[PDB]
Amino acid sequence: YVSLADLERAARDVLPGEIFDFLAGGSGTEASLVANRTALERVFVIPRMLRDLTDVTTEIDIFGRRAALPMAVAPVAYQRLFHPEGELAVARAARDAGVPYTICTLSSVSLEEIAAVGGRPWFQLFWLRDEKRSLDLVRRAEDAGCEAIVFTVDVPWMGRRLRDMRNGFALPEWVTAANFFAPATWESVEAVRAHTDLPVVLKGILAVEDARRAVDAGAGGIVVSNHGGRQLDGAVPGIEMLGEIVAAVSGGCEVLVDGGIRSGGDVLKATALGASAVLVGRPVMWALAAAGQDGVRQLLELLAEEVRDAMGLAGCESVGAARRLNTKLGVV
Amino acid sequence: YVSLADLERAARDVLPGEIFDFLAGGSGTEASLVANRTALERVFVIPRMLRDLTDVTTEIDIFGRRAALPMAVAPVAYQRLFHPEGELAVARAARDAGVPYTICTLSSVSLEEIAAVGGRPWFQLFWLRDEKRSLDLVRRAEDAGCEAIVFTVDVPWMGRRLRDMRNGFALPEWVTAANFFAPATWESVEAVRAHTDLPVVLKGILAVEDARRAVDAGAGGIVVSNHGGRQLDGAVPGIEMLGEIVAAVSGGCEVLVDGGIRSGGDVLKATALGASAVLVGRPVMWALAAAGQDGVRQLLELLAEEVRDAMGLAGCESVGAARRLNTKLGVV
Amino acid sequence: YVSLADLERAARDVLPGEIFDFLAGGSGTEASLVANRTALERVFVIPRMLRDLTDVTTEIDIFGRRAALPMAVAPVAYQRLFHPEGELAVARAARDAGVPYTICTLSSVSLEEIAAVGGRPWFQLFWLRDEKRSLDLVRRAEDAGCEAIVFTVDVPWMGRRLRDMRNGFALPEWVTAANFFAPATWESVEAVRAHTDLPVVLKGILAVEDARRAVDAGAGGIVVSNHGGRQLDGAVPGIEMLGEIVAAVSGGCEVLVDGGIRSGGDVLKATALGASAVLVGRPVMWALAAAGQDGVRQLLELLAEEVRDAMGLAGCESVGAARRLNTKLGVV
Amino acid sequence: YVSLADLERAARDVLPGEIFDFLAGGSGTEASLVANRTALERVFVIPRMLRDLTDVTTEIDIFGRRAALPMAVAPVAYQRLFHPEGELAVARAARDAGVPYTICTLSSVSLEEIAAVGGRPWFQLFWLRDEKRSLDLVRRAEDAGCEAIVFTVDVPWMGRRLRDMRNGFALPEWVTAANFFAPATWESVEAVRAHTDLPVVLKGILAVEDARRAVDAGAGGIVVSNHGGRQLDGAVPGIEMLGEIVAAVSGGCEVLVDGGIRSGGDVLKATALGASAVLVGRPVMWALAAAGQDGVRQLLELLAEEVRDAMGLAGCESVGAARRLNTKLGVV
Ligand SMILES: Cc1cc2nc3c(=O)[nH]c(=O)nc-3n(C[C@H](O)[C@H](O)[C@H](O)COP(=O)(O)O)c2cc1C
Ligand SMILES: Cc1cc2nc3c(=O)[nH]c(=O)nc-3n(C[C@H](O)[C@H](O)[C@H](O)COP(=O)(O)O)c2cc1C
Ligand SMILES: Cc1cc2nc3c(=O)[nH]c(=O)nc-3n(C[C@H](O)[C@H](O)[C@H](O)COP(=O)(O)O)c2cc1C
Ligand SMILES: Cc1cc2nc3c(=O)[nH]c(=O)nc-3n(C[C@H](O)[C@H](O)[C@H](O)COP(=O)(O)O)c2cc1C
Ligand SMILES: O=Cc1ccccc1
Ligand SMILES: O=Cc1ccccc1
Ligand SMILES: O=Cc1ccccc1
Ligand SMILES: O=Cc1ccccc1
Ligand SMILES: O=Cc1ccccc1
Ligand SMILES: O=Cc1ccccc1
Ligand SMILES: O=Cc1ccccc1
Ligand SMILES: O=Cc1ccccc1
Ligand SMILES: O=Cc1ccccc1
Ligand SMILES: O=Cc1ccccc1
Ligand SMILES: O=Cc1ccccc1
Ligand SMILES: O=Cc1ccccc1
Incomplete structure (x- = not known):
């Protein structure tokens, strides 16, 4: 494989159509799904030249741990849909690469099993029916050695995924929520913050004032995200809000982004x-x-290899240097 | 049906081509018809997270009545072209959904028949040959229990609809103007305002100064609109003028919009x-x-269901909250 | 015919390909030819409503004569390529419609023959080999009753029309320059201005400072134009310079535009x-x-009919009112 | 041939696919390769009219020598891939046209052979394994009569050319680096500057501050370039940085550009x-x-012929006049 796009073609060949559509799809007209790609494609980097690249490193420190790349595996529910080893296959590969893996509340293998793989597991939280049960998932994850709680804040309920509706998609009998909901609020965030000493990372922030309030609320991080275009159809891409959000938080928490990263x-x-x-x-x-x-x-x-190549071509011996690069918007 | 686009495909299957073209078409090159869609597709919403959604409501108060959604059925002439029950079918469905229905001057069932369905009927006015006759349509509508007069102000005469010209389209014999014209001016507006205590709503405003003058003229509302791209070919979409118009009237009348709303x-x-x-x-x-x-x-x-879904995904428990959302323009 | 595009399809059917290509083509990659259309398509009008349209008129006064529409027939060489009556057919139709016709230096019927048709003939000048001969074409045109001298200033030499090169296009034997060159300069303009009391109109101005200098030079008008994309490939469309030019001349001469007008x-x-x-x-x-x-x-x-329709739909009883309309740039 | 595009079609017919792909390709998704073209196509020129064109000249003085056109042949490695005479064929044609030819460090004919053709040879440097060997290539080029050292500064290592990976491309046995690497830094530049009195030209500058530092470092020129989209995929086109860079250096060195020039x-x-x-x-x-x-x-x-045509159509008797032309960005 020489690009991530070689892997999409390979996955489309093997998966049943309805499962490929569960994976690929967005909500509504898929405008936000497409815009994630559009938005990245419009961004051009202004590389620097003639800088020392003796010791180029892609490592970062985040939430108290070194990571091999400035990347983590996003939370994706029900990974046994894709392969029989599901979450364990992905978690093992992530561990061996030195990148964090996000264990889902809706994992198809229990969070304790996946955490036992080792590595840098984080845990993604969906707010449950009651405060007490939500907090017991958080405590389970902490007890199992997860390093951060990724609280998904963009899902008061699931978006309208028309591919899944059209296909009548349902989980096969052999895939279940192995760890076994209500809308989260800022009160829910505070309950989680008070219950754990792990960093709490709010995933699905797009408004600048929500980013600021996240810092004020004691978040250790945010993920600037439209949930891969699966939640509000018409939501701005995270990449379009990111620069404004980074400026507004002014170092008060880590600021991650997702949606359409393909290289x-x-x-x-x-x-x-x-x-x-x-x-x-x-x-x-x-x-x-x-x-x-x-x-x-x-x-x-x-x-x-792509991250190292891009960094060095751009004159960046470290991720911090990459953060200081300037960009220009183009067309198509 | 899981999107409004499923209904277009279904209507194209059943209607005769010339009738589908009367419905679908615009004037000229259809630039304004296409631009209504383009303009909405370029708008992205910045949703808010973690707000209380216990009691999400899509209701609004407008022209003295509660409506179930921030929507009304636009005036469309000659609805018996589309189905034999014509206006009565649509009016009954609107009533049962709690959304206002606009009865047309060129309705194919009499305004009194349609008003008798109940619900929240409004009445759309085309200015006639003489002041006295125009005012007698207005008084008829008022006597029948219509709640607002939607004065169409963008039709000094009908636009050049080339599909209709090419098809040689004419009304079948079994469709007539069951309520049975000259260019309207600001004097015409004043005549109507003086003749009724109902709110007068000017439909087809696009210039900011026309919006301001509408308020000064005593309108209770405006509809920011290019008449679905059927009047001036090259007229700006209403959605492109709306923010400027809302600012200029600064709460002095209700500001509605139309053109290309499809979800x-x-x-x-x-x-x-x-x-x-x-x-x-x-x-x-x-x-x-x-x-x-x-x-x-x-x-x-x-x-x-789509409006409730979008509002809640965007953190809005009420339509007023939705009005306070910010937006960002994107590409394609 | 219900649009100008119906006439293109009809002309493509009848003309020999090489002649259609002489007519249709531009220079180079045809970027400026395409951009003339792109630029108009991006412009949207903000129409006004509820204005008096009792006496809508499309007439203008220009160069001392009433014209029926704010339009003239552009200079196009060698009109016998297109029809055997050539210039005389077009001039007769223009006369009968009340719109000026521009007689070309490279007309295929003599300027005196065409002027004898009547109407409002203007005369387009290409600068010749010597001042004396150029001035004798100007005096011929004046003696024949032409009303304005349209001095083409964008043709120091003809552009590279690749269609014509690829086709090996040449005039048939039966088409000649019936009135029978060097680069024009500002001195040439002054020579013409001094030789005639007719208004001198400089065609092919695109830079703002050239528009100002045209006024200073005593021009009665300019035509803001990239020569239909036939001269510099990559020249800006005139429609893109027009607003800036109109502001800069601030009423000091008439400001015409061409390129891609199709409705x-x-x-x-x-x-x-x-x-x-x-x-x-x-x-x-x-x-x-x-x-x-x-x-x-x-x-x-x-x-x-299209001009009257557009004006009235936009609330304009006169061309001067149309000049006071505002516009908004859109996409596609 | 009447456009450069006629030559691409001809080359695609004759070359083996893998060699055509080595030539045509870019890195990654080829976004920067495409953007070089996009960016030029969006630029429109505002031509001037009525200027003296008696003595239009396309000549420039650069690095102490007259050139016939404001153009040089870019460094392209391994020209025997394309024709058996390789570099010598190109160098002879360049000499006879009066345009500089850039001899590559990775030339398939020795630099001394190519320099012996005559003309205005420049020499392109890739930094080697050690300072001493790099400097001996520079001294070889100087001894052979090269006029400038074009130090390529955008290649700490070669980009990821997926076409070449997919094709398994390798040099045929009959093509070698006839003159026979490590990342260059600003120290490397200084070593070269101190070793030669020839002008040193840094090729592959895109950041404004790198342009300024190039002047401060004693460069005689820069080439504003993304290496034809072959290095960082996502690097801005040089043409998009050029105006800003020209302003920043404010005449302190020559500022060249490349990428997508096709007319x-x-x-x-x-x-x-x-x-x-x-x-x-x-x-x-x-x-x-x-x-x-x-x-x-x-x-x-x-x-x-195209450069002379464009200059004169734009009113420019000299390249310096062309530099004073204004431009406008358009769409598509
Ligand atoms: C099939 C699927 C399932 C997902 N499940 C979850 C989830 O359980 N929790 C969550 O916070 N995000 C979930 N996401 C969103 C992802 O974490 C991520 O925000 C999104 O996929 C955007 O990134 P991409 O373009 O790299 O896929 C899911 C995404 C997909 C495609
Ligand atoms: C077939 C048809 C007939 C219409 N008749 C009327 C009318 O009688 N009065 C009026 O004010 N608008 C009329 N309109 C305009 C609509 O009220 C509305 O402004 C337009 O359809 C834009 O909305 P859409 O994209 O949702 O169709 C008509 C529209 C259509 C398609
Ligand atoms: C076939 C052809 C011949 C032309 N000949 C002349 C000419 O002799 N003199 C001149 O000033 N312009 C000439 N023009 C340019 C036109 O006057 C006008 O600027 C151009 O066609 C742009 O308008 P359009 O898009 O309406 O064609 C010619 C244009 C065409 C297509
Ligand atoms: C096949 C190929 C080989 C190249 N080799 C070199 C090289 O050895 N040194 C260098 O500085 N640039 C090299 N370049 C980059 C060119 O000098 C130039 O920057 C690039 O081709 C952009 O211009 P274009 O669009 O005119 O091709 C190469 C380009 C191509 C296509
Ligand atoms: O978009 C995320 C998701 C998660 C679980 C089930 C369905 C969708
Ligand atoms: O169906 C899964 C789910 C997850 C979070 C919130 C609501 C629903
Ligand atoms: O307007 C900001 C922006 C940022 C990234 C991509 C597209 C737009
Ligand atoms: O565009 C609105 C309309 C109304 C009646 C007849 C034809 C068109
Ligand atoms: O033909 C219908 C009509 C309606 C309003 C104004 C003019 C014409
Ligand atoms: O320029 C304002 C605007 C608003 C909505 C859509 C497109 C443009
Ligand atoms: O573009 C204008 C023209 C005029 C005469 C001959 C060829 C072209
Ligand atoms: O070939 C026609 C012509 C016209 C004007 C200037 C130069 C050439
Ligand atoms: O930038 C000005 C403009 C004007 C008309 C069309 C396109 C652009
Ligand atoms: O892109 C430039 C290049 C040079 C030598 C070998 C391969 C590529
Ligand atoms: O493989 C060729 C090369 C050239 C310059 C730097 C690194 C590699
Ligand atoms: O924004 C500057 C620019 C310059 C040339 C082409 C495209 C963009």
Whole structure:
């Protein structure tokens, strides 16, 4: 595989159509799904030349741990839909690559099983029916050795995914929510913050004032995101809000971005716009579908080489240097 | 049906081509018809997160009455072209959904018949040959229980609809103007205002100074509109003027918009740009053609669910909150 | 015919390909030819409503004569290429419609013959080999009753028309320059100005400072133009310079525009951007090819109806009112 | 041949696919390769009229020598891939046209052989393994009569050219680096500057501050360039940075540009944006592939005629006048 797009073609060949559509799809007309790509494609980097590249490193420190790349695997529910080893295949590959893996509340293998793989597991939270049960998922994750709580804040309920409606998609019998909902509010955030000493990271922030309030609320991070175009159809891409958000928080929490990251050059763009790191979703699932654990490993190796290549071509010996790159908007 | 576009495909299957073209078409090169869609597609919403959604409501108060959604059925002439029950089918569905229905001067069923259906009927006025006759349509509508007079101000004469010219389109013998023209001026507006205590709503305003003068003239509302691209070919879309107009009137009348609204997400965009409410035209006729009254009911149910979904995903428990959302222009 | 585009299809059917390509083509990659259309299509008009349209008139006064429309027939060389009656057919139709016709230095019928048709003939000048001969064409035109000298200033030499090169195009033997060159300068302009009391109109101005210098030089008008994309490939469209030029001359001469005018709505756009009038080239030749004099008459009747329709839909009882319309740039 | 695009079609016919792909390709998704073209196509020139064109000249003085056109042949490695005479064919044609030819460090004929052709040879440097060897290539080039050292500064390592990866491309046995690497830094630049009295020209500058530092470092020139989209995928086109860079250096060194120059009109655009001169890469290789030396001669003759045509149509008797032209950005 020489690009992430080789993995999409391979996954489309193997997966049943309805499962590929569950993975690929967005809400509504898929305007936000398409815009994630449009927005990255319009961004051009202004590279620097003639800088020392003796010791180029793609490593970052985030939430108290070194990561090999400025990237983590996004939370994607129900990974046994894609391969029989599901979450465990992906988590093992992530661990071996040195990148954090986000364990989902709707994982198809229990969070404790996945955490036992090792590595840098984070845990993604959906707010449940009651405060007490939500907090017991958080405590389970903490007890299992997860390093951060990624509280998804863009899902008061799930968006309208028309592909899934048209296909009548449902989980096969052999895929379940192995860890076993209500709209979250700022009160819910405070309940979680008070319940754990782990960093709380709010995923699905797009308004500048929500980013500021996240810092004020004691978040350790945010993920600037439209949920891969799966929630509000017409929501702005995160990449379009990122520079404004980075300025507004002015170092008060880590600022991650996701949506449409499909290469190491896209990772460079995100960092040049101010991101601490990115999440990658769909491509990880394509690799899992195509070739299981070894597929995910190959994807992460490819991304690592693309990120190193882009950084050095742009004159950046470190991710911090990449954050200081300037950008220019173009057309098409 | 899971989107309004499913209803267009269904209506195209059933209607005779020349009738579909009367419905679908615009004037000239159809530049304004296309631009209505282009303009909405370029608008992205910046949603808010973590707000209380216990009691999300899509209701609004307008012209002294509660409406179930921030939407009314636009005036569309000659609805018996589309289904044999024509206006009565649509009016019954609108009533049962709690949304206002605009009775046309060129209705194919008499205004009194349609008003007798109940609901929240408004009445759309075309200025006639003489002041006295125009005013007698207005008084008829008022006597029949219509709640607002929607004075169409963008039709000194009808635009050049080339599809209709090419097809040699004419009304079938079995469709007539069941209520049975000259260019309206500001004097005409004053004559109507003096003749009725109902709110007068000027439909087809696009210039900012015309919006201000409408308020000064005692209008209770305006509809910011290029008449669905059927009048001046090259007229700006209403959605492109709306934010400027909302600012200029600064609460002095209700500001509605129409043209290309095709989803609850489009309704959210319009409200985020400052609209009090939208009108929907073509899609209502697609539903009527496809399945009569029950079709229109299904369309309104679908729109209601899309509007609620979009509002809540965007953090809005009320339409007023939606009006306070910010937006960003994108590409394609 | 219900649009000017119906006439292009008709002309393409009848003309030999190499002649159609001589007519249709531009220089180079045809970027400026395409951009003339792109630029008009991006312009949207903000129409006004509720104004008195009792006496809508499309007439203007220009160069001391009333014209029926704010339009003249552009200079197009060698009109016998398109129809055997050539210039005389077009001139007769123009006369009968009340619009000026521009007689070309490279006309295929002598300027005196064409002037004898009557109407409002103008005369287009290419600068010759020597001052004395150039001035004798000007004096011939004046003696024949031409009303204005349209000095073409964008042709130091002819552009590179690749269609014509690829086709090996040459004039048939039966088409000649019936009135029978060097680069013009500002000195040439002064020589012409001193030689005639007719208004001198400089055609092919695009830089703002050239527009100002034209006024200072005693021009009675300019035509803001890239020569229909036939001269510099990459030259800005005139419509893109027009508003800036209108502001800079601040009423010191008439400011016409050409390039891509294909409807009465395009005429309205040009006037809203500040043009006194437009020239129309290719479409007049399409009508001539399709149906001779009667074709040109039908085209002018169609344009007159489109201009009246657009003006009134936009609330303009006069061309001066149209000049006061505002515009908004859109997309696609 | 009447455009440079006729030469691409001819080269595609003759070359083996993998060699055509080595020539045509870019890195990654080829976004920067495409953007070079997009960016030029969006630029429109505002031509001037009525200026004296008695003695139009396309000549410039650069690096102490007259050149016939504001253009040089870009460095392209391994020209024997394209034709058996390789570099010698191109160098002879360049010499006979009066335009500089850039001899590559990775030339397939030795630099001394190519320099012996005569003309205005420049020499392109890739930084080697050690300072001493790099400097001995520079001294070789100087001893052979090269006039400038074009130090390529955008290649710490070669970009990821996916076409070449997919094709498994390798040099045939009969093509070698006939003159026979590490990342260059600002120290490397100083070492070269101290070693030669020839002008040092830094090729691959895109950041404004890198342009300024180049002047401060004693460069005689820069080439504003993204390496034809072959290095960082997502790097801004040089043409998009050029105006800003020209302003920042404020005459302190020559400022060249490359990437996508495909006509004399593109040369005019570059000069209007402030370039001293352009480089042309791919098209020279197309001509070499199509017809060897005589092909390159025909290409240079065509470009010379296009540059003269564009300059004069734009009112420019000299390249300096062309630099004073203004431009406007358009769409598509
Ligand atoms: C099939 C699928 C399932 C997802 N499940 C979750 C989830 O359970 N929790 C969550 O916070 N995000 C979820 N996401 C959103 C991703 O975490 C991420 O925001 C999104 O996929 C955008 O990134 P991409 O373009 O890299 O896929 C899901 C995405 C997909 C495609
Ligand atoms: C077939 C048809 C007939 C119409 N008749 C009228 C009318 O009688 N009065 C009026 O004010 N508007 C009329 N309109 C305009 C609509 O009220 C509305 O402004 C327009 O359809 C734009 O909305 P849409 O894109 O939702 O269709 C008509 C529209 C259509 C398509
Ligand atoms: C076939 C052809 C011949 C032309 N000949 C002349 C000419 O002799 N003199 C001149 O000033 N312009 C000439 N023009 C330019 C036109 O006057 C006008 O500027 C141009 O056609 C743009 O308008 P259009 O898009 O309406 O064709 C010619 C145009 C065409 C298509
Ligand atoms: C096949 C190929 C080989 C190249 N080799 C070199 C090189 O050895 N050194 C260098 O500085 N640039 C090299 N370049 C880049 C060119 O000098 C130039 O920057 C680029 O081709 C952009 O111009 P174009 O669009 O005119 O091709 C190469 C380009 C191509 C296409
Ligand atoms: O978009 C995220 C998602 C998560 C679980 C089920 C369906 C969708
Ligand atoms: O159906 C899954 C879900 C997840 C979070 C909130 C609401 C629903
Ligand atoms: O307007 C900001 C922006 C940022 C990234 C991509 C597109 C737009
Ligand atoms: O565009 C509105 C309309 C109304 C009646 C007849 C024809 C068209
Ligand atoms: O033909 C219908 C009509 C309506 C209003 C004004 C003029 C004409
Ligand atoms: O320029 C304002 C605007 C508003 C909505 C859509 C497109 C443009
Ligand atoms: O573009 C104008 C023209 C005029 C005469 C001959 C060829 C072209
Ligand atoms: O070939 C026609 C012509 C016209 C004006 C200037 C130069 C050439
Ligand atoms: O930038 C001004 C403009 C004017 C008309 C069309 C396109 C652009
Ligand atoms: O892009 C330039 C190049 C040079 C030598 C080998 C391969 C590529
Ligand atoms: O492979 C060729 C090369 C050239 C310059 C730097 C690194 C590699
Ligand atoms: O924004 C500057 C620019 C310059 C040339 C082409 C495109 C953009």
